[PDB]
Write a protein that binds this DNA or RNA. Structure first.
Ligand SMILES: Nc1ccn([C@H]2C[C@H](O)[C@@H](COP(=O)(O)NP(=O)(O)OP(=O)(O)O)O2)c(=O)n1
Ligand SMILES: [Cl-]
Ligand SMILES: [Cl-]
Ligand SMILES: [Cl-]
Ligand SMILES: [Mg+2]
Ligand SMILES: [Mg+2]
Ligand code: NA
Length: 326
DNA sequence: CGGCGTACG
DNA sequence: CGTA
DNA sequence: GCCG
């Protein structure tokens, strides 16, 4: 079991679901308190269990596994022995955890804003609606659309949605392409949003594309909310039987030279990409982002024609998107 | 003990 | 600050 | 919280 999540296959569904979900509760709570280090450890420990070939049935099977120390092991031990971890349950039902989760789920609200509201005594969504003066335009849209945005986006919604984006993209720049990325590319059947990566086969032709795409989508009456730019975080009108629902849609443009790096980054998972960039820098001395891979000694960028190229340049066995569910 | 990913809006 |  |  290698120490980095990018060094091992992680399938979407696995054999330790209950154990990973408990550790990710503690990771989430750590983030609500600003403890990024503890969040990472609990996330990594959870991911290790996702990568195991069978269920953990005894504590001894944790020996030698990376990122399992006294704390994470005690969590697993109690779940194995009693089916419940007291610390996890105490977090679950705490007013702090429940409210920070409720607030951070709002589009436009992060940990710092939710914490401030919590210290001010706010606890419910209606508490926020009553004092709308303290809300950004982004937060007003997230709060108004919160109910729809809390329902999972279905894979069966995605194809129809990709078609309307492609139509706007094709008018904005003939020859431009739309690629489904994010969780759905990793095989997820549901998602919190839909993530689309846009490019054009002729390097440079994609410059200035996203404003033209957004203007056409808005002209179609499809944009319920959006803010030179290359990333757009929108709220889209998705048809439903006799009606419609609001859905979150992310659009990002990249030049074809950077497409493999953008596809890799936007396909995730989030933990997988953090681990991959950490591996790149700490183990290989290379700097990785969604734009390229930089050698700081030669001061050169590595050209990539595919995701496979990138895995090879980092000395990692290739993992298909379905095995990046860290 | 230092480090914990790295961007854009 | 928010966002991926 | 854990690794190196
Ligand atoms: N902080 C973040 C957020 C996202 N990302 C990347 C990897 C994610 O898979 C991808 C898409 O972000 P995302 O839409 O918020 N999450 P994802 O699509 O994987 O699952 P959903 O929650 O959307 O169902 O961007 C990242 O690298 N760092
Ligand atoms: Cl911490
Ligand atoms: Cl270069
Ligand atoms: Cl990036
Ligand atoms: Mg997504
Ligand atoms: Mg997204
Ligand atoms: Na939020």
């Amino acid at each position: 079991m290698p120490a980095y999540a990018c060094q091992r296959p992680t399938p979407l569904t696995h054999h330790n679901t209950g154990l990973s979900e408990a550790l990710e509760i503690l990771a989430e709570a750590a983030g609500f308190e600003g403890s990024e280090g503890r969040l990472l450890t609990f996330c990594r420990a959870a991911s290790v269990l996702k990568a195991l070939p069978s269920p953990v049935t005894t504590l001894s099977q944790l020996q030698g596994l990376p990122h399992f120390g006294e704390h994470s092991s005690r969590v697993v031990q109690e779940l194995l022995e009693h089916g419940v971890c007291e610390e996890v349950e105490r977090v679950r039902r705490s007013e702090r955890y429940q409210t920070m989760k409720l607030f951070t789920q709002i589009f436009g609200v992060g940990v710092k804003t939710a914490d401030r509201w919590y210290r001010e005594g706010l606890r419910t969504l209606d508490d926020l609606r009553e004092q709308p003066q303290k809300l950004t335009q982004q937060q007003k849209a997230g709060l108004q659309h919160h109910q729809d945005l809390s329902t999972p986006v279905l894979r069966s919604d995605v194809d129809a949605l990709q078609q309307v984006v492609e139509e706007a993209v094709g008018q904005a720049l003939p020859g431009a392409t739309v690629t489904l990325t994010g969780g759905f590319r990793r095989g997820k059947l549901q998602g919190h949003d839909v993530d689309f990566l846009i490019t054009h086969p002729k390097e440079g032709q994609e410059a200035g594309l996203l404003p033209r795409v957004m203007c056409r989508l808005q002209d179609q009456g499809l944009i319920l909310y959006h803010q030179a730019f290359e990333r757009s975080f929108c709220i889209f009108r998705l048809p439903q039987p006799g009606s419609w629902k609001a859905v979150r849609v992310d659009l990002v443009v990249a030049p074809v030279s950077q497409f493999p790096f953008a596809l890799l980054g936007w396909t995730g998972s989030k933990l997988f990409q953090r681990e991959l960039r950490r591996f790149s820098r700490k183990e290989k001395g290379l700097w990785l982002n969604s734009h390229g891979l930089f050698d700081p000694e030669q001061k050169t960028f590595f050209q990539a024609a595919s995701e496979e190229d990138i895995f090879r340049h980092l000395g990692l066995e290739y993992l298909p998107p379905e095995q990046r569910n860290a």
